[PDB]
Design a protein around this nucleic acid. Sequence first.
RNA 1: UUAUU
Lengths: 140, 142
Amino acid sequence: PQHYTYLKEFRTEQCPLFVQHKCTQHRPYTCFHWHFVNQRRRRSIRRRDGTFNYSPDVYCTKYDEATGLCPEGDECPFLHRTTGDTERRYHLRYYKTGICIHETDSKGNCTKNGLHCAFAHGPHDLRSPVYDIRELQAME
Amino acid sequence: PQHYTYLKEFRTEQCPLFVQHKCTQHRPYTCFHWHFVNQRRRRSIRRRDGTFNYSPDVYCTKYDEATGLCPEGDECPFLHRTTGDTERRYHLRYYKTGICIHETDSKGNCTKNGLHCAFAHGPHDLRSPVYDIRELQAMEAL
RNA sequence: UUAUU
Ligand SMILES: [Zn+2]
Ligand SMILES: [Zn+2]
Ligand SMILES: [Zn+2]
Ligand SMILES: [Zn+2]
Ligand SMILES: [Zn+2]
Ligand SMILES: [Zn+2]
């Protein structure tokens, strides 16, 4: 059940090893957790009213990619282009919904995008998109 | 599988619903999260040197069971008698290492402790203990 | 494809 943990937790909290100068995954940057705020991801959520807490498609124009700060903060309804575009790649709408074009290795992981590839490697690894009620209503 | 989620997470964080009287899993207290501080457990951890962050056997005498406070907090090397004895029961050393004496119901859950039961129901549900390097030494000598 | 541009 790795999908749940990535959707809920990927890059949402700071790496405790990094603050102790002990994270081996800073360069190149491959950690599960954020090291700087400009690498922080907001958990993507579908609210009870059927809307996403933020869009899977429209990028915020005020988000400061260098500092990880948006004037509207986390309540911003638009997508933030954080490091590695992880708000989009790990969004309920898109995470693991397409097939990865890259080969799969013997442990079932991506040969090119590393352990955190957000494309699917095999049927067990594919999920159906979750849609905003507004996308569903457009699809009609 | 579900073992890792219990080991790492069970009753380690405060329930955001309970603080608002919106948790429906209080009495019968089936919530995965703590509601009162004395229900909170610290995640047990095997350090790189092979020792546990805190013992699964020797109980802290400073831990106030009424308030859930120990002066050493997460760094106390001794076991806290949290409500339901959850630090011991969900410890790496003991969680699901033995068979529950109680029976399972028709959903696959313990009849006395429900789905959260810390003993294994069926040999398929067993895990091997994780041992402190010290216990490994004493055990080998037998 | 949400990392095939
Ligand atoms: Zn790290
Ligand atoms: Zn924004
Ligand atoms: Zn891939
Ligand atoms: Zn609760
Ligand atoms: Zn203590
Ligand atoms: Zn039981």
